[PDB]
Point group: C3
Chain length 482, copies 3
């Protein structure tokens, strides 16, 4: 007689995962699917990262003197720091967020000076709240007009767009603190500013009243913008309180954006940037921050998700029935034989290769490699606003919940199918071996066959290869069994 047993490998330290059917099952190998940490640094490649330091994007656009270093800059990602401050004439922007988003998306601050003529007024007004060295100054891209002599005439100027790209104009209106100041700077008791194209118009009447002192001044300035398409024309008509433009900004379509962060910038390479720093993108999910730029993993709420990579781990001649082989390091499935010569062991390459090829590349079949997103909505707020902020928060929360559910279900399903396939492979190998031994062998019921004839080492090798001929040993076996 002889013994031929079939078995599968096991490891001393396994990992616990979750399936559709079982909450905890131990397997021989697993991988983590959620990225949960960052180095805390922002890499300067391959995206062009521009550090704003102590300047906001709007202050750099307007021409705050301590931001003069930012003239005509370009970026892929503009990083705004929390220590930024303003040091010029106090101002406000109706719909600040929209202008900020527009400028950030455009990705450039290229400015072209134009030859405006302002007949009968003084130009280049200044203030002690915006100092350029020792002298009083103002925003570098704006022109503060006041009366000349004792008159402030009606201004009526035009500028056509004879290029083939769009023009962006930034202009403003001054709000004085008293009626006496209004008459002192602009002769008329009530100013008016009108800015129009062939398809749009805006008219502003200034507001008068005392306000809290900011850098010594109780007056204010309001900022507005206008876009002029190719073939159109801009007309400015005003009888007081005009803060004139000095030229226009180019506006482009691209993949630029802006981000708030305090992380330092270092020399390295990374495709995914968050406010916490750069993160690697080899995993499909991340838990670091829902604000991202570049090729990034999808944000989820879970901090860990384990995907099974090997078969179930069963502690440890016998077969595979509730028994694993801790002494096998040559493969996943294999044979053992007990004989007159002695015990021997070998592995099955075909079933191991089939299992590995099935397991490898599993998650790429369902989920995409990397989703690249560049400019998105704001997801953190500093002031309370109401309806629109509520809607933005609701949208983000809904998206996060749905993607977290997707990730959980996908991991559970994949683990279930991996376990099932490994078990089926083992059973198929056992059944094929049973098919080869037609009537000369019997199943012991523990995954092990007993062969009734003399099966030496060459006999076992013939069985393992698949060239076993039962007829040769048929009659003898029929004598041993009955």
């Amino acid at each position: 007689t002889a013994t031929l047993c079939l078995g599968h490998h096991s490891v001393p330290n396994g990992t616990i995962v979750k399936t559709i059917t079982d909450d905890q099952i131990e397997v021989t190998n697993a991988t983590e699917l959620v990225q949960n940490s960052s180095t805390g640094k922002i890499c300067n490649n391959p995206h062009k990262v521009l550090d704003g330091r102590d300047c906001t994007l709007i202050d750099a656009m307007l021409g705050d003197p301590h931001c003069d270093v930012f003239q005509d800059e370009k970026w892929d990602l503009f990083v705004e720091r929390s220590s930024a401050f303003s040091n010029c004439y106090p101002y406000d922007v109706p719909d600040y967020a929209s202008l900020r988003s527009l400028i950030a998306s455009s990705g450039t601050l290229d400015f072209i000076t134009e030859s405006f003529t302002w007949a009968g007024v003084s130009q280049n007004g200044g203030s002690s709240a915006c100092k350029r060295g020792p002298a009083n100054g103002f925003f570098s891209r704006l022109n503060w007009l006041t009366k000349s002599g004792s008159s402030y005439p009606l201004l009526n100027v035009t500028m056509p767009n004879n290029y083939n790209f769009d023009k962006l104009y930034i202009w403003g209106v001054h709000h004085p603190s008293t009626n006496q100041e209004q008459t002192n700077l602009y002769v008329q008791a009530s100013g008016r500013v009108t800015v129009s194209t062939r398809r749009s118009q805006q008219t502003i009447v200034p507001n008068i009243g005392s306000r809290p002192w900011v850098r010594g001044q109780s007056g204010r300035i309001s900022i507005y913008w206008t876009i002029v398409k190719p073939g159109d024309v801009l007309v400015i008509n005003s009888n007081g309180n005009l803060i004139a433009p000095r030229g226009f900004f180019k506006i482009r379509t691209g993949r630029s954006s802006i981000m708030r962060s305090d992380a330092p910038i270092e020399t390295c390479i990374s495709e995914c940037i968050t406010p916490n720093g750069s993160i690697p993108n080899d995993k499909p999910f991340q838990n670091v921050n829902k604000i991202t730029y570049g090729a990034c993993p999808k944000y989820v709420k879970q901090n860990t998700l384990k995907l099974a990579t090997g078969m179930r781990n069963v502690p440890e001649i016998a077969g595979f029935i509730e028994n694993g082989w801790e002494g096998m390091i040559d493969g996943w499935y294999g044979f053992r034989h007990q004989n007159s010569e002695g015990t021997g062991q070998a592995a099955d390459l075909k079933s191991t290769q089939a299992a590995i090829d099935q397991i490898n590349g599993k998650l790429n079949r369902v989920i995409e490699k990397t989703n690249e997103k560049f400019h998105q909505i704001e997801k953190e707020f500093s002031e309370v606003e109401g309806r629109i902020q509520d809607l933005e928060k609701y949208v983000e929360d809904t998206k996060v919940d749905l993607w977290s559910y997707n990730a959980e279900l996908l991991v559970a399903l994949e683990n279930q199918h991996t376990i099932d396939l490994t078990d089926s492979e083992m059973n198929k190998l056992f059944e094929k071996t049973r098919r080869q031994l037609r009537e000369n062998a019997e199943d012991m019921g523990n995954g092990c066959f007993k062969i009734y004839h003399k099966c030496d080492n060459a006999c076992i090798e013939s069985i393992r290869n698949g060239t076993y001929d039962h007829d040769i040993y048929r009659d003898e076996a029929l004598n041993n069994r009955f």
Copy 2:
């Protein structure tokens, strides 16, 4: 000889479910996953529910006399009734929804009086449209200023924030019906109101014109609000038409919200509130209302979803092949034996336990227990508005469709796997029994084994336990079978 059959339990009345593969299959037990009814009452525990009977939140905030009972109230959920009405001076709020949302989210009406000084004007103006008993009155939190003698001087007042929390100020502007009324109440022919901090400013010019009578009055009032951060200062500068504040409201961050409902409030306990009433949250899905507050099931479009909790139900010695055992009430899987002593029956505990432990707790592996949401967007509207309302409706519709698809797919998948696992358990038990009987038994092909030796009750019990020794009965069987 003897007969040993394997079988599974059956029930007289089963339930229909749907799987991935079959449109309808009958099982022995199932559970409903969608909650589709409410008692029609709102429970007063554990959330603090405040009923605004005849008052809206805005009217209670401003100080409508018939809302005077609501001064300095707090809530977790404010319930607005459809029979609420206004009984004071006619008014309107630019961006009513935003102020309503922010007050509701704050969750309190705590008001602190401040000592404003208004020099040269008369205070506490009233109207017959807002009666406090027999006398003419006004909103309790606002101060109506008019001329004193024959003059209305320029008002210029300031108030600093020396606390460590934010302040909310409510103020207003009066719109008269005629120019004569304008000059009669405020000496100047055109009023103006300016309210500012160091970081913001608002200026309002009143509108003059006749309007439809409301409680005898053709004039109107417009309401505005301002938030003052710690370390900032509020400045009010007015030439006329000012409705002054009397103090400030505390504004907080929390989980409070507001709801429109007509359901009565009763003494009970429930964690999930809808406009239809309170609902239990033991099920993962609900169909009652997409407006919810608290720990609630997810809203879906389906009114019923059945999850299988038992094996397939097959109508009814024989085995398990296309035959169930209605006479088995001691377990799920079991043995029957036919012998010289007589027929006998028993149940298998291990396979039953494995099946039950697999079935129990299946849905908790994929879906979360309860998602708590407190303040969300509005989902029902009474007027047509356009762009923003279209966006809100679109967002809600997208969310509902995606979650309904998720629920349908999850139920189908879980039912498929439950059926598969029960079938596999039965087959495994049969194969194990076949393994134990090595050569002394024959498979009848109906799920039954024919034993060709004398197998008495003790022999049956040895087979069932797993201690059956074939060698003892080997030779005799070989004589009987051949």
Copy 3:
């Protein structure tokens, strides 16, 4: 002895699909789930499609002369062309998109004229920028008021809503180019327009200043609207610069909408319309356009998704069984028997297992996904100008929805293919095991899916085995001598 083999059909040209476990597996039949093409025409049935031609919806509402043919029209879908233009007095609409969406959703332009009284002013002002034939004209639904003699008195007019439906009023304000023009047309140096109900009010002060010439004019007009509920009243109070309404529009609730397209309209039937044209809706997914109207498939990013309809396709390499071998010579069913005997070889098919497999395969996708979701009026999804916050939010919402539905479609196809392959394999194995059960001890398995029967099993014996009425005892003893 005799031979009995079990096998399954195969085809000379199979199709590749993807499952959860395999990147590529070849099956005998598959179907495409994504619609990726259109005929380029919009069908005029069953929806009512109205071609705007050279007019926008707002211009047709206001009464632009070259749009006069659109008076009192109705639609289910309004189609705006890219060659539309305006040919009247220059104007602008604050919140243009909201008014456009409201009118498009209402679905009608039914107008009722009312008898307003404007005492002390002249009516029916016109311009050379808006010509009706040879004469100067104006919008047909608006009345341009102007001074009479040397005075422009204060106007207070009222109109009550005594019906049981809502009223929509469109009105406007004129912005002159100079102060002299302001005093010439309206005596007062600063005009004012107030429009109010019991629950709302709006007041407009006109703006003065020079603007670029549009059809000879530097002045402008601004357009506003007001809704009056049943039992309410409208009051108009003005002392200059008013563009008065002539009546009211009916406003309805329904499923009407508007779409931008240049596709021509033809006589045909189709339930789903896109800017590219009509598309059939027999498939659950589409890749043509994310803008749709009617009963339409869900938009996804993938251009193809193949769902398996048959079993795995195995080529055909002494008859053999189903083990790594298919039967190209079988055209009568999916699973079948073959027998080798003294009379000769014979073949037959199994009807029960084939029927079970087909009934499982048929109608699988309808169990999970709904047939058709009908959507009528939605948000805008393409923009011509940069705006900022709201446009960013709309684009973000649409992108999120598209990504989630694409993931759903991919996962569903993979899961369904996996289960189809599993069910076909299980059916074949079950048939083989049943056949093994019938031959209790009278036959031996060769291990290639084929049994060999030790006794004399003729054609009638084969048929008895196939039917399920084979009795082993009859041939028991004889086989027990052949085997041992």
